[PDB]
């Protein structure tokens, strides 16, 4: 008796098609919006996606009342899910992030496989013995595609007479593909490459959602009739309702070991020699090593690097995100952080791996590791509108600008030993960057007389570098190797570059930059966020070739690109804080020790003391 497993929003249920009139048994309850379902029969596992909890979860069918979270981040509308029972992998689609992703069965080693030309991806079906995956897309260009389960050889197999392709399944016995179209009111079948397409049933399908198969019978769920229907897989005859009055039928499978035929795993017993993911592949040797999202596979084709070498770090008002710069997909991963209300400026310390960011609603400077763990408050008093922040990775100090207080201030990196460095002639201070090797800080002011200014790292010898043809200089970035500084101006709508002494000024970008805010340089590239275009973009600093990194993301703010671990440059503050009891503030002419309020330097020029009454 073919058992049918289906998702039902608040629960997952099992019904036997033989006695379909009977009450369906509840497999898992307490769910919110369970949508996609699949299983690993040999492992006794049932998986489901929940689109309100934004999670994929699993349970063991034998035991009871133990729901295991598998994927709980990075999901918005995970509408389709498929288990690779041969290679032991999990695949899913997401129609809001526009991605197809793969992971191990426990959710580890997640990798985004496809991120382009996905609009409303939905159903996904696997042929692990042939290394091919199939999925539907009911979006602007509706289609059925096929690709390697390693992400290779992507091909459109059906692109005509298609509109809402909601359901998709495979017949492993006859090597056939079946799908249901909820607009064109039919179920069709074809070979695995799309050829010899044939109509199975036509007209009795108000709103089919998911389709499955067992022996010579197709089974599908229908959103408008709230039921599971069935017909003969060759002729469409004998159409009938198996099970009715279902609250909200979603994905469905024939729950059987025979629907997951056993074959040799090409990965063997050594995971193919792959350090991380061993994915089924449709070409000899029929596996392919892969790496987590953003991570490069080395030359041997087997061993992953240790994480991304370079990251783009984003503040985005209500969250922070990181994007690897190592791979072409530019997947933004949201950091797991608490109480992010209005994050604005961001920087990063590669020595300890701390991101630092400002927030003018929390009114605090905070830091964390690149995944959101280790999160700590750094500065909480007299924070008002801190629109710029910079890490001094050499002297281990933290700088910020605040247009709510009209100051530039410095602390140690953990927020202690605070000193006001600039407290006059700041109207709208914003971006701030540091050159510890040379002894300078630079900052922008977008007030009524806009400026780019320079001072020593103690705020002394203040000088205006640029005060003409500026308006809203929001972004600032040094090119340490080339002796240049770049800026983005949201009023003149320009990205400009000049030597750090103010010579050689010239316009780099002039078009389609209506409102830069975030702004950073790494290697050959300048990156920015644009408040009006709602995009992250970059330009090659010599060729001026532009690339869109992310489009249509609201609430973009500050941006910093960085090597994750490597730092360059030094000065005498790096050695025992210069001997300074409190702050060591380097200048081109030599370091100056400094003190928080109420302390004074004594005659050794190093030690701060509260002076006697």
């Amino acid at each position, epitope marked *: 008796a073919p058992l049918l497993l289906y998702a039902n929003r*608040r629960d997952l249920r099992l019904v036997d098609a033989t006695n379909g009139k009977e009450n369906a048994t509840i497999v898992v309850g307490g769910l*919110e*919006d369970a*949508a996609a379902v699949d299983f690993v029969f040999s492992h006794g596992l049932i998986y489901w996606s929940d*689109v*309100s909890e934004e999670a994929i979860k699993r349970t063991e069918f034998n035991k009871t009342e133990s729901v295991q979270n598998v994927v709980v981040s990075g999901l918005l*509308s995970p*509408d389709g899910l498929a288990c690779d029972w041969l290679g032991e992998k999990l695949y899913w689609t997401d*129609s809001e992030t526009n991605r197809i992703e793969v992971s191990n069965l426990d959710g580890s080693l997640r990798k985004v496989l496809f991120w382009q030309e996905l609009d*409303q991806p939905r159903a996904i079906a696997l042929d692990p013995s042939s290394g091919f995956m199939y999925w539907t897309d*009911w979006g602007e260009v509706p289609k059925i595609e096929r690709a390697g389960m390693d992400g290779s050889s992507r091909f459109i197999i059906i692109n005509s007479e298609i509109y*809402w392709p*909601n359901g998709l399944t495979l017949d492993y016995e006859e090597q056939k593909l079946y799908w249901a179209d*909820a*607009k064109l*009111n039919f179920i069709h079948k074809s070979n695995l490459d799309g050829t010899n397409r044939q109509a199975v049933v036509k007209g009795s399908l*108000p*709103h089919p959602f998911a389709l499955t198969l067992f022996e010579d019978i197709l089974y599908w769920t229908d959103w*408008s009739t709230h039921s599971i229907l069935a017909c003969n897989k060759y002729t469409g005859e004998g159409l009938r309702e198996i099970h009715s009055d279902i*609250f*909200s039928p*979603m994905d469905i499978h024939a729950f059987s070991q025979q629907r997951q035929p056993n074959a040799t795993n090409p990965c063997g017993i050594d995971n193919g020699g792959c350090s991380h993911l061993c994915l089924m592949s449709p070409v000899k040797p029929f596996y392919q090593c892969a790496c987590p999202t953003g991570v490069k596979l080395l030359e041997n084709g087997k061993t992953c690097k240790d994480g991304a070498t370079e990251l783009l770090l984003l503040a985005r008002r209500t969250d922070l995100r990181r994007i690897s710069l190592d791979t072409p997909d530019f997947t933004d991963i949201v950091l797991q952080l608490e109480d992010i209300r209005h994050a604005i400026a961001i920087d990063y310390d590669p020595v300890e791996g701390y991101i630092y960011w400002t927030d003018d609603e929390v009114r605090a400077i905070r830091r964390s590791f690149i995944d959101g763990s280790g999160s700590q408050f750094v500065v909480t008093a007299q924070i008002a509108h801190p629109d710029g922040i910079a890490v001094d990775w050499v002297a281990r100090n933290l700088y910020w600008t605040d247009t709510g207080t009209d100051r530039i201030e410095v602390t140690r990196l953990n927020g202690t030993m605070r000193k006001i460095l600039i407290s006059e002639d700041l109207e709208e201070p914003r971006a701030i960057v540091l050159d510890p090797m040379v002894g300078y800080m630079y900052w922008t002011d977008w007030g009524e007389i806009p400026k780019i200014e320079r001072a020593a790292l103690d705020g002394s010898d203040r000088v205006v570098l640029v005060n003409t043809s500026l308006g809203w200089p929001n972004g600032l970035a040094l090119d340490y190797d080339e002796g240049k500084i770049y800026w983005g101006d949201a009023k003149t709508d320009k990205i400009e570059v000049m030597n750090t002494d103010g010579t050689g000024r010239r316009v780099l970008v002039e078009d389609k930059i209506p409102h830069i805010f975030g702004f950073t340089l790494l290697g050959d590239y300048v990156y920015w966020t644009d408040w009006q275009r709602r995009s992250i973009e970059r330009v090659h600093k010599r060729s001026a070739e532009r690339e869109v990194i992310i489009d249509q993301l609201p609430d973009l703010m500050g941006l910093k690109a960085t090597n994750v671990h490597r730092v360059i440059g030094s000065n005498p503050c790096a050695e025992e804080n210069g001997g300074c009891s409190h702050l060591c503030l380097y200048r081109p002419q030599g370091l100056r020790c400094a003190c928080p309020i109420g302390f004074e330097l004594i005659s050794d020029m190093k030690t701060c003391i509260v002076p006697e009454h």
Partner: antibody
Amino acid sequence: SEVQLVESGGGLVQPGGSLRLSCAASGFTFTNSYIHWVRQAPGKGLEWVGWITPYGGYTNYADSVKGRFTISADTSKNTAYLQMNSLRAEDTAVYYCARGSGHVNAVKNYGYVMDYWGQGTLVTVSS
Amino acid sequence: DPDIQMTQSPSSLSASVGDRVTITCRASQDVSTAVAWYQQKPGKAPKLLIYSASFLYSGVPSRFSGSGSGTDFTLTISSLQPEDFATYYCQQSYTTPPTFGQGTKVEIKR
């Protein structure tokens, strides 16, 4: 480009009589939406009457109107209709049409969230 | 199946300009977060304020907010304005038929 829903057809009708309301839609893809009728008796609250999904013409109705009211749609005119037969005094109300939010085929379905409402048309059933 | 009953409270209230106003809506069945709130000015069609229990609809001022899940839902106006005189309705968007609370009439005290 603005979403608009323009009702017409209301008026006075004797009990037992019939009336057809129209809801002319513009500014969105008609067939990707639920179109609802919702009514409000004088001084009272909101009561859902029924919906149609124009992509295939499927409908649902409130038990209080079942069998007497029929909803239909004409995709070529981007118009929905409420055919009201065997009208009763207690059918007196301002009749609104309203668009369900989101896409009819989406998994995260907001189709019962009524994000744009027409101005309403008054139906009075009286002798 | 029984229609889902939405019970709003209070039926009417009066508050000063600048007051925080909270309206409650209780569902007779668990409806997850599938709750919407509307504002109805006299002689006008309802306008959507909140959907999915807490999501602010585009264009709606930020003084409106919503919260809750399961059966207990609230609408908050954090600083009442003279133009906020209206009847406010909750509605479950969870299943058919959509059903509405009986409304809360908000008056401005002066």
